[PDB]
């Protein structure tokens, strides 16, 4: 089944869409906006969901 | 001032907020902000014809609620 | 390739481009025919131009083969209907659909590339005698596309 | 703002699997294909289908 | 998944079962089309029934998705071609192949379970009037599978 | 009397020593001896149809050098 | 922080948890009260335990301050109701909602860490005489949480 | 049979299990679906941590019960 | 009762039926019997997810890494 | 990949039956004897012949 | 670096990838990986003498393509 | 016993060992004869030692009885040719073959156990004067093994 929750707002700010993909290795957890995710990476926090370190934040478009 | 629509490469339709005096270069900048596509890979088509960068929407008689068609930059050869 | 091709056919039934139509020839889903209407305010105005489409077995990673079957006067299309156009080869993208390819080809009719031409004689006329270019293209439109 | 309603639509290449293969280039990513299809493009050294930027990596994208 | 899928396809090329065929249409190995001939001496005899097969990316650890595209009258298969069969869900085995799955479905055609059906109306008729059941399934085979 | 063949689950083919009067359940117990598969997990198929436990090979027109097809126990529902 | 807290409150109302309950004390959305049901099959069984919650202004980037207001016998919870627990400190996650924090705290009751205790005397007892530990913990539950 | 797991964000997923599934079997299936390593998973039912080494039948966990996923934690 | 010859496992050199690549060294044990048709890597994946034996559906007691001296 | 061509040869003890008696110890096994011969070893409390670990069990081993 | 051969207990010959500075104990570890034999029950013989876990292959002037011989740990008495 | 012994003989024919040779004494497959080359860099260098081998009825569950018939000087072999060696008694293994047994015996020559000896006199001389032992062994080798 398909990602119906991807339409829901960022779980952190509950305001902006989920367009800040949190990347680690070849996998990523997409559940937050670019602003909130960039904050985590700026402060060297790990991924909120899997606790892996954050390799990068990718601004994610759905073309 | 007016709304127009762009049918993007995947078939998804987006809405832009434009002026008649907006250049095509300007429109592509807005598509870049919404979709993450550099303007030089954008080719806009209206009534079967491509829209040149330095000409305005109104130079092509593109009015409120028109639909532009986005394809990929191409080169006859 | 099949389910992608069926989706493209559904989109052509529901919301096709203004100048462009296409569908399977018979029951062969990998062999289509297409039409492009000559754009208004252009030497092709009032002509209808037929094309042949063959989808390769690993469409859409590989581009369709696209050729005119209607003769047409243009610097990047020759007498056999072969179209020299980068999105049909090295600049193909798998996000392009037949609908988008046809619209693209439609935009090429009005915006030729005479600087890297498939038919050099027609390109010279296009660059230096646009009155005669428009005239001959109009004549070919009446002779072959009406 | 506008939320991505087209995210539940299938991969635009195979028209079957979910959109979970994010195509990364620089700081942006285009998510319109499944991981299997996007990976095939990366292995064949193809650019991004929608913007033609070189593909940096394909990210298997989860939606927690 | 691909290598396993390629081995199954080669097997079908060299030694298919009598009743069943399947393969990809293009180069897309994850999407197959299949056919099952209605078994002799059944309501389905003389019919050819098309199915669609989608392999998940962790095949063969997870089952293929299999659905009829030809309409068939049967208590465990509904008007969308959905097949309520345990080896397609909780009783899948990685040792099953598409060949064995098609053969299993084929054996389900003449051994339905009306006591726990997908289509209640058809199970009632199967239990309370076998002749009418055979009449109808025969008419459906003639109408849709020929 | 005669040999038959059984295409097992993995595609491997085995040879069985049978009388035409042997029951289907007899054949399954032979498959268990050869392959370690419990008879209640064996579904044998011939001419597109499963073979019932209390019938004989002759009850199914199974001749010598016939091939039976072994799949897993299944339940429609 | 406000929008995220409001979201959590509405989620709690739309979908109340089985093991805990929580909401604002009156008007201040940053100060909440909560209740934890003691785990069945434990010394805390049948007890109901109250807690206070203060959200910092950069919640959920920073953890909420969470303390018991009902006395409870545990090596990692002291007479101030303070809870020494890594997810409230350095192992916090912005994806933890207050419902998840409360369920996590509840699971800590039967999963104490006596080797790094907040109340050494309770932990020594836990490590040397377990039946003596359970006896007392049941006593405190009946004295203070019923 | 099927059970539910309410994951960290509140999203609910479905798992295919047997009564003999151990809790580590369950965490492995959660990782398959959600890409969360098992050693940062903590599963809770009826207010108690479920322990690696014990099975769903050991905990009498019912078909279509819901297990609650939080993050690995430690008191101190 | 006729004389029965021993028969030897010629299919033992075929690759794992799951990955079609690696040798059959992952033995699936249940009771006092084993079904050896997958590599250790593929069989451990079944065991780690408590899936049954693929050919007989008995529960997988243990996977044995099998050497052939 | 080195495939076990020697799995097809007879039991190294009786040289007559196939190698269907796996000698199990922990999570590894040595397969070189038939079931009958390997049970004799287990019955007599002998260790594994090639590695000298104790014999946990003999598993009758099929190649399906 | 180089490769060598080990004749195992049944006579089956196997191949290892080693460096001339590898310890005897290091070779036995690679033998344990391929054959499941604990090193403390391995006895490697070369030129009729036992090889001791401290030395290396160069110590014993063991060139590439040499065959080492494996028996079981033994002790006179 | 017989088939296994046969097998060991064929394998000897296929891959002849370099430190030793062995085969049946004429007609009796259960009575064998063997020779060992004395190791280089050792006091047995250049010697050829003969051994007698007898297989019991339940070979290979029980070890062969192996004794030297060439006199030799060594703490773990006595004047009757008896070899006190653990693999020939309690540490036997059915995977051992005559070839492996002989090579094992050859490596015992340069790896004696003086601390639990068969011949104490030779043992004491091995511990206290290594130089004497090698002189004597070389002499015994020259006297008896050429
Ligand atoms: Zn946000
Ligand atoms: Zn993550
Ligand atoms: Zn795809
Ligand atoms: Zn892109
Ligand atoms: Zn495998
Ligand atoms: Zn099995
Ligand atoms: Zn044997
Ligand atoms: Zn062993």
From TrEMBL, chains B, F, K:
Keywords: Cytoplasm, Isopeptide bond, Ribonucleoprotein, Ribosomal protein, Zinc. Its main location: cytoplasm. The keyword Ribonucleoprotein applies. In the N-terminal section; belongs to the ubiquitin family. Part of the 40S ribosomal subunit. Part of the small subunit (SSU) processome, composed of more than 70 proteins and the RNA chaperone small nucleolar RNA (snoRNA) U3. Component of the 40S subunit of the ribosome. Part of the small subunit (SSU) processome, first precursor of the small eukaryotic ribosomal subunit. During the assembly of the SSU processome in the nucleolus, many ribosome biogenesis factors, an RNA chaperone and ribosomal proteins associate with the nascent pre-rRNA and work in concert to generate RNA folding, modifications, rearrangements and cleavage as well as targeted degradation of pre-ribosomal RNA by the RNA exosome. This is Ubiquitin-ribosomal protein eS31 fusion protein. It comes from Homo sapiens. The lineage of its organism: Eukaryota, Metazoa, Chordata, Craniata, Vertebrata.
């Amino acid at each position: 089944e398909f990602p119906h929750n991807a339409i829901e707002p960022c779980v952190i700010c509950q305001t902006r869409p989920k367009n800040g993909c949190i990347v680690h290795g070849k996998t990523g957890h997409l559940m937050a906006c670019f602003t909130c995710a960039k904050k985590l990476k700026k402060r060297n926090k790990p991924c909120p969901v899997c606790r892996q370190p954050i390799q990068m934040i990718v601004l994610t478009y759905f073309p | 001032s007016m709304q127009i629509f762009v049918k993007t490469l995947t078939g998804k339709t987006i809405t832009l907020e434009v002026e008649p005096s907006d250049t095509i270069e300007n429109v592509k900048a807005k598509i870049q902000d919404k979709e993450g596509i550099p303007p030089d890979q954008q080719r806009l088509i209206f009534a079967g014809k491509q829209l040149e960068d330095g000409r305005t929407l109104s130079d092509y008689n593109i009015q409120k609620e028109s639909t532009l068609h986005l394809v990929l930059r191409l080169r006859g050869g | 390739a099949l389910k992608r091709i069926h989706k493209e056919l559904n989109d052509l039934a529901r919301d096709p481009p203004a100048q462009c139509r296409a569908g399977p020839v018979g029951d062969d889903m990998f062999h289509w025919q297409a039409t492009i209407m000559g754009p208004n305010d252009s030497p092709y105005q009032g002509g209808v131009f037929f094309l042949t489409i063959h989808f390769p077995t690993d469409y859409p990673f590989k581009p369709p083969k696209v050729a005119f079957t209607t003769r047409i006067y243009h610097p990047n299309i020759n007498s056999n209907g072969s179209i020299k156009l980068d999105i049909l080869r090295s600049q193909w993208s798998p996000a392009l659909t037949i609908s988008k390819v046809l619209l693209s080809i439609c935009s090429l009719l009005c915006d030729p590339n005479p600087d890297d031409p498939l038919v050099p004689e027609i390109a010279r006329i296009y660059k230096t005698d646009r009155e005669k270019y428009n005239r001959i293209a109009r004549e070919w439109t009446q002779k072959y596309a009406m």
